[PDB]
Design a protein around this nucleic acid. Structure first.
Lengths: 62, 120, 56, 122
RNA sequence: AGGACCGAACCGACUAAUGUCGAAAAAUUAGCGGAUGACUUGUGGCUGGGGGUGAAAGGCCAAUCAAACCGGGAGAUAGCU
RNA sequence: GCUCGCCGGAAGACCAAGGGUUCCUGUCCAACGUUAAUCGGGGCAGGGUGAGUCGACCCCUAAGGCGAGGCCGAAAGGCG
RNA sequence: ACACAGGUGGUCAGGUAGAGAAUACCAAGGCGCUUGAGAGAACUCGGGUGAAGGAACUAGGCAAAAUGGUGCCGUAACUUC
RNA sequence: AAUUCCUUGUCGGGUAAGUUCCGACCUGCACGAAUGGCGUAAUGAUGGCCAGGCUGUCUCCACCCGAGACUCAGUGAAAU
RNA sequence: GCUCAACGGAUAAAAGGUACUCCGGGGAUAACAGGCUGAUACCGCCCAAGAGUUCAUAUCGACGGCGGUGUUUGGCACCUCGAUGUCGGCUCAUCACAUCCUGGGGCUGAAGUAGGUCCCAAGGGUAUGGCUGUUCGCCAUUUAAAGUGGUACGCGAGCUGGGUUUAGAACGUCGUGAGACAGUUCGGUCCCUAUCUGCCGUGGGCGCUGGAGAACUGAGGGGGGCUGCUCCUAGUACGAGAGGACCGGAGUGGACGCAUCACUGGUGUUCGGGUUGUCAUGCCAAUGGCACUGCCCGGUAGCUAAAUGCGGAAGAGAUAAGUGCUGAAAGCAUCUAAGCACGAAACUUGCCCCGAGAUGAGUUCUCCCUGACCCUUUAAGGGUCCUGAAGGAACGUUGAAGACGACGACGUUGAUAGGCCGGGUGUGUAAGCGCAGCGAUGCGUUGAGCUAACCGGUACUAAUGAACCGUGAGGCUUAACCU
């Protein structure tokens, strides 16, 4: 998790739990911000795990 | 933390502080008896007793040196001429401090300062 | 910063009780003119230790 | 008393002129260097034909100190300057074969007998 | 010659500190920008509230500006306190 | 009064603007002064400003104001 | 709204050094700012100096410090010359 | 890029370490020819990246000079 | 019959942005933290074969199951919208163990050096930096190890605005348009003297019950608790070459804390000299003042550190896991139900400091107090005269003591402070005079002169002898000893 400031009024302090997921015996991380929910942010991180993981294997087959 | 500090700044900054004694001691020998704030006399006596002590042994260079101090020739026309001669026998101890009262302005400790001789 | 209450008059006096001025309790009579004057001071007319060393 | 970011002068061979410390070696949160302390340096000026070039990490052991030393009977030996000699950081070897400039009596600690052999002073 | 340059008085106020029931209802101190021009100031007048003026902010109009100030509508109205 | 220090192309000497007797002397200390004050720009009584050549008023003009004529507009009023 | 470290037009404006009304010390003149006497703790502000290193501090070389004047030789990229 | 959320995209230089900085590739979510495009000497109380010197910013602060702060005498508040 | 998109239709004619905002409000209705729950996350267990050369217990441990804590995202709107007012960093902490090393160990797919895994454990340490505001993160360099979290996602009545939100401006996209944003780019008033509680020091009054001046015991409390490398033991044990010990002893650093100015320095506006401009004593010399000590070069006593020393234990009792000894319930086994012995940086202590207001008011030593009358609830009553004790306080000179108090030295049976004498230390050849010479200037007299806090002395000066407070014999009861 890493957390960052945002936009608000006179008092605002909350920072968002932004997620960063990797495949450790390969290395490549996945941080995705295109949906804001607890495990569902992982459900795009794993979406963009396997998509980027498949983005490896396609050009190899070329 | 004032551990062995032989100085009393008297809430006066430096250049005013040294000249305070410069003007006072000249007036001190002027009338031989004055009255002032009690801590002020408790520091001037560490100056004027050397000022007699340099007048104890006379030199024209000392007279030149005692013009470099206090910048007045009539003062050293008074010193080296009665006091220095008459306090030749006395080695240390030249004024006397006694406590008058308190100042009507804002309760400042008032003391008499005069010499042990005092002209009579 | 201020009290959120008002301080009572008792603790006022409990604060105030440590504040007596003085008594001198040490009175030095002049040997010559009987001037009950301040110890280690001269008298009002200037005697000290049985002596008119004020030279006034 | 040598820390990081300290631009000493090279007084030995192996083709450097100016170096600078990034890390005081030696211990767990150690913050200072003794007279013959071990100092991880990088190279900030080297001659063109020299062995090592600018910008490469290595160990190097100091010799000369602007602060100087104290003698154990109480004399300071101040050096107007600060010098250091290089080390082979993976095998701790002083690669110095030609060193000019004085050294320290305190440096005789038997990892430096190759150094004090090449000492033309002190 | 210079909407040239360095730089006092003058005008303005870039940065930091002090100040905030302060020295002061926006200033002081050390350094700054302009200082021959689109510069600055003194005196006498003119344009005005849903308008004036504007090198343009919607800034300023007597310490009171997305609307000054005063009196009357009106004791507006208020399922809000 | 005698020493010391400070400003000194001003913390100085005169005018206009504007304030409005605050200017001087004697006497006094409750109130004014961030302290006492026989001190003062405080109270009270009294005194002080002298002009043909200084300024202003006076005569003559610009911006601008009023504006018989006059034109315009519910009136007020506006412009000339 | 105060006996307020602020602001306000015109005239005069010397001696020495100095290009200069910049600056330093003084002349003429006018004053020591209307609460002081002592103490010399923490801490705040206005300032000085500093051994070794020298931005490693930090949002950023911000604040500070350093550099600083006249003459002589010489002076690159670029350029509307 | 003052323009790119993904993205800190990708190679080298600067560097011990380099999301920012200087060039190039083009995979331009959503550059573009007067909502002007690409350069540009002189200039800027304009933003960002380094080198030289210098210093207390920092390693770790230490001492010193004053106005306050502490006591005493005089007047004696204020927010709540 | 036009006629009700919202169909009890407010006529059958009606869309937005406000972060320029403004007013009346609500925790009736959102965000941070707090609260209940625990889907999710994390952690500990249940069963179980397979991969694993032989073997499920070295691990993963699936197909599934049982629970715990409250740090993630949420769920519910309980508290506050008549303000609970800021993410991160600087700084300063601080606790629980699910522990990063460390010590004690079981086991090993640990041969050994060295590791893997599990338990006890808060005791101590738990980095310096580049880029972004980023905590996060990527990365470089060491040591033994750079531990996970809680505490309004600790700390803003301590700091910054950098981020992030207003007033200005710029870019791109969507829209007819104002403007807005899964976005980014410069600059942007950050306030407050502390009543109480809290915490660190420091005093007074009373008390301590006869008063005063001193010396300690000692409960309780706090601080301290990290270790690295090398050598001897021994390059012996072990081992497949290669490699290479625990224990006991000694030496030596880092970082942290305490103490100290002798030694190495810094400051030293109270000690000297130099020098620029300028004013003053008539001019010059000799000097003084001002310009931040004008700029400076050094330096005593002091003060602080980088400088100089020390600590990190060992040991005694019981321990946590663990190793056991003999031997049960069960004729035997087995550390176990009796008993005893070893074994952690962890506890009581040990090392030091505060310390009897610890009311349980403790112990010892010394000094001093031993006169008559009245009313009388004959009471622990009050009062006049006469003595004023031991001592303290007050006052004055002062401290390497200190905010005011306090503590210590001194008050004449005298060295507390100042001045002074000899000296010391520092600044380096004063003033005047003579010679060389056009001159400035140099040389000689001259290690002499000038000298603050320092060493040993000196009553020369100042601390006046006194005075004020404080007593005039210790209550009631009980007991063993004595006229």
């Amino acid at each position: 998790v890493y957390r960052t400031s945002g936009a608000g009024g006179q008092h605002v302090n909350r920072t968002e739990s932004a997620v960063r997921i990797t495949h450790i015996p390969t290395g490549i991380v996945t941080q995705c911000q295109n949906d804001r929910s607890q495990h569902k942010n992982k459900d795009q991180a794993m979406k963009q795990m396997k998509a980027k993981l498949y983005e490896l294997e396609m050009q190899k087959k070329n | 933390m004032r551990h062995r500090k032989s100085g009393r700044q008297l809430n006066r900054n430096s250049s005013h502080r040294q000249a305070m004694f410069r003007n006072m001691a000249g007036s001190l020998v002027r009338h031989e008896i004055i009255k002032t704030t009690l801590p002020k006399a408790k520091e001037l006596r560490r100056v004027v007793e050397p000022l007699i002590t340099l007048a104890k042994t006379d030199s024209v260079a000392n007279r030149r040196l005692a013009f470099a101090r206090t910048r007045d020739n009539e003062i050293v026309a008074k010193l080296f001429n009665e006091l220095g001669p008459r306090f030749a026998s006395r080695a240390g101890g030249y004024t006397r401090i006694l406590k008058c009262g308190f100042r009507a302005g804002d309760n400042a400790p008032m003391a008499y300062i005069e010499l042990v001789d005092r002209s009579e | 910063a201020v009290q959120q209450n008002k301080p009572t008059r008792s603790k006022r006096g409990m604060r105030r009780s440590h504040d007596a001025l003085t008594a001198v309790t040490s009175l030095s009579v002049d040997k010559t003119s009987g001037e009950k004057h301040l110890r280690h001071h001269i008298t009002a007319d200037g005697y000290y230790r049985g002596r008119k060393v004020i030279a006034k | 008393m040598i820390q990081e970011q300290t631009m000493l002068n090279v007084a030995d061979n192996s083709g450097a002129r100016r170096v600078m410390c990034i890390k005081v070696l030696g211990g767990s949160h150690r913050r200072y260097a003794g007279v013959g302390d071990i100092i991880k340096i990088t190279i900030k000026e080297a001659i063109p034909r020299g062995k090592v070039k600018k910008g490469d990490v290595l160990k190097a052991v100091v010799v000369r100190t602007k602060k100087g030393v104290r003698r154990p009977d109480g004399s300071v030996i101040r050096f107007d300057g600060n010098a250091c000699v290089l080390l082979n950081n993976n095998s701790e070897q002083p690669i110095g074969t030609r060193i000019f400039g004085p050294v320290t009596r305190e440096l005789r600690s038997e990892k430096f007998m190759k150094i004090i052999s090449l000492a033309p002073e002190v």
